[PDB]
Each structure stands twice: as structure tokens, then as C-alpha cells.
Amino acid sequence: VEKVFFVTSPIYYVNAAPHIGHVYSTLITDVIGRYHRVKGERVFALTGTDEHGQKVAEAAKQKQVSPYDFTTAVAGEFKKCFEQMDYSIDYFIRTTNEQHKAVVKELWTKLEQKGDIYLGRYEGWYSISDESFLTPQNITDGVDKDGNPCKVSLESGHVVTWVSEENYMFRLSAFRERLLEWYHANPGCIVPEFRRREVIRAVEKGLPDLSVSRARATLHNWAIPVPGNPDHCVYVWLDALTNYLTGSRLRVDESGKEVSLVDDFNELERFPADVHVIGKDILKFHAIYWPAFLLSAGLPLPKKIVAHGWWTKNVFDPVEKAEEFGYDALKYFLLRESGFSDDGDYSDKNMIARLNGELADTLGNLVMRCTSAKINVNGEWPSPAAYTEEDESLIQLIKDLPGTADHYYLIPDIQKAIIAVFDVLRAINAYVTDMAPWKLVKTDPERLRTVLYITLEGVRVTTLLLSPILPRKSVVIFDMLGVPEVHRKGIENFEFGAVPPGTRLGPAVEVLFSKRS
Ligand code: MET
């Protein structure tokens, strides 16, 4: 099934300013998008803002601004942040958008016509900050912003309150068996695996029905009205989850503005999402509620949900650190340092160790050696002579790398993809040290041709596979190597030997990554 590769980030609450969590989630989305573009596929990458609900309106109230003005301002800060971070996101969605509201109303009506929405009651605990319903087993005692005694969430530590309201209810309990069949039939649908096991255990225990509306006064009228009942508003999470459906149905112009909402999602070939990137804090919403809504509506389910170790909802300003250390270097560090965990060192010391050790010493040094005037005297890609067994061992690593890295990118597991590329870079470095091509200029010119060609080609292939991670630096590297534009993307260029001998190197000026103290 040839379709548009559809990758999403969460849509972020606009109660507060952009921070590292939001930047991190969207970075992962961006990298996955970029890898699939390098591979030659059509890609639609989506990010955005979640603008309705009690928590947004109360934040606007604290600042003494209208919710309309507040959300527009904070949305602008997110947009500016993602422009500065140099992502390649295809559309930035806002839940205040009138086309999004239309889609929410269509979906609501469909669910109602199916008999899956009924009028009932929610009597229980609720976290306003997480916009989440909680059972009594998910609460404990704690303190609020002042220090007085109250109940808090076990998940997040935020304050919980008791709600008693007549509400529209989604019959989530009826979808337990179908959800379990989906999990078992598609064992790669939630990543990483231990988070998949958590979701399955939760659904095995039983599912209550889910309140999908609230009384309008409780949301300070800052929400989408229920179709046919203006006393009620749509639950911010059904509103929010639906952004993925809306985004899949928007025609977007060259400047990034939506120009049209299509009726049928199949027209644009995006839905369902190939990858939903999320933080671990919103797993239940994406792995239980969302597929239940889609099953109810008769819509296709997403292929993968990837849940990272960080939270979504001692300063670490990403734009400040990127100005200090470099944008590509920061992106590299964030993706290299952690897999699916919080355990990981984000200090200036470790940042410098990885910058110096991996980017400067391993990658950078290797790029300078194979392009240097001392070693590469003709300033071109030489034609290789016969290969030794040691040459063939390195060639085999380079040939195997695209297959290996591709599998890791598709999990997706970006940390392992990076590690696999750097294992090959270390092997190329060891080979260059062994062969000592600086001595071979005088002693054995024929042998240097072979050594230099293999080095150039190893640097090209590794750089291609790192281009989703280091998009700006990869362009500089390809320019130094003199790699034509046509050879900078497409699965055809993952093969060893794609750049012919005779190709002239690009002109010299000059540091790729400068080391720090
Ligand atoms: C449909 S993704 C919603 C994410 C949510 N607004 C959050 O910030 O956690």
C-alpha cells in the first residue's frame, strides 16, 4: 500500500511557554519525517497546539487576558520556537481552527449514530492539569502550590478534585475485547515493548466508560459545543486526539496555511498515522481511548505509537544551548543520550564529551583526513585498485549499515540507529590508522587510491544515514566531498559505490565541529 508517510507529535497545551519536553517530542517527529524523505517517500509531518479546556482558560485568567488572545500569543511562541529549532514540519495545527471544530463535530455525530455515546454521570476524581479522569486507586495524599493538605495524582503529582456531573459517556467498556485483539494481532503497534505490556495489562483488568463531555460552566465556555446540546462541551481529549484526523484532511499551501478541508481522508492518503510520537504520560489516551474512538467510527487504526521516556506536560533552555553548542550537535546529543528512559546525563560535561569525542574526533576528524590536501592530493574521488581482506571487511560493514540502520529507524529507535552508524565510523577510523594513508602518498600511490576511496565512500554512506539527525552538517559534509545533489537522497544511494571515481571534491576555506574546554 503506497501512501503518504504520516508522522505526528502530540499537540501541546498552551498554558505555558515552549520548553525542552515539547522540543524533544517534536524533534523525534521531525527526525522520523526526515528519514522517510531521505528514503524517497512522500511524508506529512504534523505538530501543533491544544488550546481548549479548563486548564488553558484558568491560565489565561491568571494572566488577566482573554483565552482567545492568550492561546494565539502562546501558539505564536511555539511556532517561533520550532522555526528556530529548524524542523521540517509540514503543518502546525491549532484546535481553535474552524476546520478542526468541524471534524470534531462530524466524529462526535458518527459516534452518537453508532450508539456509542449516551447520557450518564461521572462521579469521581479528575486532574485538571492532566485533563484526566482517575479512579481512587490512582490518587494519594499530598500538597498544592501553597502547601495546604489535598489529594494528588499518583501518575503526575498534580492536584485532583472530585467532580459530580451529568455527562455524555462513550461506551469504552464495549471495546475491551477488540482492543486486546488489536494489540495481540499487531505486536509492534506500541513501542517500547514494556509500555505495550503496561497497556495490555490495564485493558485486561477492565475498562470503565469514559466521559466525553463536560458542563460548559466548568470549562469556562472555552471548548467546542456538543452538536445538538449547547449546555455541554466536548472533552478536551476527544477534541485533542481528533487533530490527527483533521491534519490528515487538510490541503496546505506552500506557506503552511491550510486552504481546504477534504471530505474523505483517503483523498490525501495520510490517515491513519504511521507513527504517533508521544510522551509516556499520555500513553493511555493514544493506546486505549483513540483506537476505541476509531473502532467506533469505523476508521483505520494507527500503525505505531512510540512513547518516549520524557514527560510532555534548574533551567534547560534548548535555544540557548543550541546557540552555545550548535543546533545539529544539540539534536544529536538529545537523540544519542537517551533511549526509552529518564536515566541519562544532560549536563554540560556530558554534552561536551559527546561533542568532542563523537562529533569532532570520530566524525569530524575523518571528514578532514579524507579531504585534506596532504592525503587527497588530486582533490577527487580516486579509482580503487584491488581490495585486501581487511578492505573487504570494512566494505562489508558499510554495505550492511543501511539495512541495519533502516530497521532501527522503523522501530523506531533513533538511539540505536545513531550507535550503529558510529560503530561503522569507529571502524573506518581504525582502518585509516592501520593503513596510515599520510605515509602512502610517497610509498605506495596505488594503495592510497584504494584506502582513500573506501574512506570517502564510508563517510558518504554514514553521513547519508545521519542526515536526518544532523541535517545542516550533512550538507556541509556532502559539499566538502563534492557529492552531487541527486546522490544525497533515495534508497538507490544507500548502496556502496554510488558516487563514481573522478568526482571532484568541493572547495576548501574551516571547522565542522569545534572542540570545547
Ligand atoms: C492529542 S495529543 C494531546 C497532548 C496534551 N495536550 C499534552 O500536552 O499532554
Give the CATH number of the domain where residue 3 resides: 3.40.50.620
Residue 138 DSSP label? G
Q: For residue 287, what are the domain limits?
A: 1-115+237-346
Asked if residue 244 has its Cβ within 6 Å of ligand 1, the reply is no
Query: What's the structural domain count of the chain?
Result: 3
The count of residues in the chain is: 517
Asked if residue 85 has its Cβ within 6 Å of ligand 1, the reply is no
For residue 396, the domain's CATH number is 1.10.730.10
CA 498–ligand 1 middle distance (angstroms)? 43
Of 9, 12, 78, the residue with max ligand 1 atoms within 8 A of its CB, to mutate for a pocket test, comes to 12
Please state, as a whole number, how many other Cβ atoms lie within 10 Å of the Cβ of residue 68.
Answer: 12
Asked if residue 10 has its Cβ within 6 Å of ligand 1, the reply is yes
- Domain co-membership, 454 together with 506: yes
Neighbouring residues of 501: CB distance < 8 A, sequence distance ≥ 6: 380, 381, 382, 383, 384, 453
- Domain co-membership, 384 together with 516: yes
Ligand 1 nearest atom to the CA of residue 241, by list position: 1
- Domain co-membership, 14 together with 122: no
- Domain co-membership, 47 together with 172: no
Residue type, 358: E
CA 43–ligand 1 middle distance (angstroms)? 22
Dihedral (Cα; 222, 224, 226, 227), 10-degree rounding: 140
* Boundary residue ending a domain (327, 346, 365): 346
* Boundary residue ending a domain (179, 208, 236): 236
- What φ, ψ does residue 48 adopt, rounded to 5°? 165, -165
PDB experimental method: X-ray
Give the distance, in angstroms, between the CA of residue 344 and the centroid of all CA atoms in the same chain: 19
CA distance 309 to 214: 31
Of 93, 282, 283, the residue with max ligand 1 atoms within 8 A of its CB, to mutate for a pocket test, comes to 282
- Domain co-membership, 212 together with 245: no
CA 312–ligand 1 middle distance (angstroms)? 8
Residue of minimum CA distance from atom 1 in ligand 1 = 241
Residue 242 DSSP label? T
* CB distance 289 to 311 below 8 Å: no
- Domain co-membership, 480 together with 504: yes
Ligand 1 nearest atom to the CA of residue 240, by list position: 1
- Domain co-membership, 125 together with 223: yes
DSSP for 247-305 reads HTTEEE-TTS-EEEE-S-GGGTT-PSPSEEEEEGGGHHIIIIIHHHHHHHHTPPPPSEE
CA distance 244 to 469: 25
- Domain co-membership, 330 together with 389: no
Ligand 1 nearest atom to the CA of residue 278, by list position: 2
- Domain co-membership, 275 together with 358: no
Query: What is the torsional sign of CA 43, 44, 48, 53?
Result: negative
- Domain co-membership, 204 together with 222: yes
